[PDB]
Amino acid sequence: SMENFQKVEKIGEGTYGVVYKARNKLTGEVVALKKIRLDTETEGVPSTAIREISLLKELNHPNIVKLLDVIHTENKLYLVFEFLHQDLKKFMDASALTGIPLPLIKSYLFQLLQGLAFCHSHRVLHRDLKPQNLLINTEGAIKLADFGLARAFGVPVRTYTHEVVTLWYRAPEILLGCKYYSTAVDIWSLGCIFAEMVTRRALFPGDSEIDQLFRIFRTLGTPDEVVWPGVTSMPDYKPSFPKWARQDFSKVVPPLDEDGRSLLSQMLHYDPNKRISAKAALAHPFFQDVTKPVPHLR
């Protein structure tokens, strides 16, 4: 069934399957193949695969990866995607000594906040926003990839999987065991990736669930019922947690201007109900140069 594709290089693993860079023998078109071995699968097509395919076949936006086709070779299921020349984790690493230019950060964040606003409006939670899943091209574009851990949400939401986001980019509401979670979990991840682009170091590089919380608490200050109405009542909340004060964002992210620091702050609000939204974040003065508003009816 994959008779027109020639595997060129192994790209990596990701949420599920194995990613290979392949070439269309006739077309000259380069794709990324995500191969799933059905022969090994006891429950058949994994739920992670079924979700990625159905969610992305309904998510067409320039800042979201394009699923090109799905091919089954009576042993294997291949997901054929658009190929992107680099991932944001490799790029930040290559730029660790240099630094990413602030205009390129602002461009990347803006495009990332657009892909998310689209996901969220189509009622899709990414639940795995980490730099290895954010794919860049040579032209200046960044796209959301790997929807393997994503889920479509209801209006209203209900209890979803707890073991859900990459530890370093995990929102305090997941960590503190809230029953419900939503769109705010992805904005937290983006807040972290934003500061990591600025500082070239992970914002909260915890080694356990408890260390993750403490690292957050040390920087943003231990939360209370005023900053977060509901904390003290939440499952994993312990009154024995050390009491820290919020650090000045001038020390936390020094290259970032007043408008940059404001957006980051609202993106990292403890209260999911108060945390900025992807759409709102687009209207923040930090992008008031890169974007000009549109007339509002009614």
């Binding site: 079924i50 076949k57 409006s121 209203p156 209890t159 419900y180 109900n273």
Partner: protein, 270 residues
């Protein structure tokens, strides 16, 4: 546009994407008009059987409605189907649905065991790929019960318009669900959008006014659907509404979301 003002997106945009999705997810009431060996009461007995397995396995009303949507949509792609193929198509539609919606879905064997040997894990594993390939991997529909969820949330919303945190009575939800479960058994429901069917069942338990407030649809939009649901509503009303069941290992804040089973076919005969 019944959704309140939204934080994460434009409430009009969200609602219109939701609406435009029913236009991209087609379902036809004359699908057995492609399968001449098949009778509409066969669909009803299978749909009833899947509700029972769902309750047995404590599955969500959502995963049952995903299987129903998958079944009715897969048939519209098939030409000639025998009565014997139905147990396989139904349980495989349920197997895909369970994996998409549940955190800990029942294993492949649990789905084979519940067919009493008539279906092996291998046929389920093959059928699953035929259904998915035939549906063209369009497995994210806004189910009948998905709409009642929306409607019920919009009814129980205060000045702090928190549209995602669930706040509504469980008993009222069940009583509206039961009616929808009873109408889903008759293949004629597919002439009415899932949004319309849900609104109309809500109407039979409330009024035109609440219905419009929570769903957006005008009475004219709902008139032919309420007209058709009229017998079903009375069969339920004649019997008296059911009670909110408890399920072991299932938290009570979600007991209303667990699929249940009754004498739905005996009631359907009317």
């Amino acid at each position: 546009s019944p959704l309140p003002v939204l934080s994460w997106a434009n409430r009009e945009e969200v609602w219109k994407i939701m609406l435009n999705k029913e236009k991209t997810y087609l379902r036809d009431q004359h699908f057995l008009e492609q399968h001449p060996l098949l009778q509409p009461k066969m669909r009803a007995i299978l749909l009833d059987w899947l509700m029972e397995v769902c309750e047995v396995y404590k599955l969500h009303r959502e995963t049952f409605y995903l299987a129903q949507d998958f079944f009715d949509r897969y048939m519209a792609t098939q030409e000639n189907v025998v009565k014997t193929l139905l147990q396989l198509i139904g349980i495989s539609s349920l197997f895909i649905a369970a994996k998409l919606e549940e955190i800990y879905p029942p294993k492949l064997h649990q789905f084979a065991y519940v067919t009493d040997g008539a279906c092996s894990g291998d046929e389920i594993l093959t059928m699953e790929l035929m259904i998915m390939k035939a549906l063209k991997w369009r497995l994210s529909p806004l189910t009948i019960v998905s709409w009642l969820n929306v409607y019920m949330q919009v009814a129980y919303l205060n000045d702090l318009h928190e549209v995602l945190l669930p706040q509504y009575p469980q008993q009222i939800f069940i009583q509206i669900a039961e009616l929808l479960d009873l109408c889903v058994l008759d293949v004629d429901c597919l002439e009415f959008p899932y949004g319309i069917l849900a609104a109309s069942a809500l109407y039979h338990f409330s009024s035109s006014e609440l219905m419009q407030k929570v769903s957006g649809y005008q009475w004219c939009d709902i008139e032919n659907c309420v007209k058709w649901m009229v017998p079903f509503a009375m069969v339920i009303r004649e019997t008296g509404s059911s009670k909110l069941k408890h399920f072991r290992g299932v938290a009570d804040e979600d007991a209303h979301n667990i699929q249940t089973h009754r004498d739905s076919l005996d009631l359907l005969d009317k």
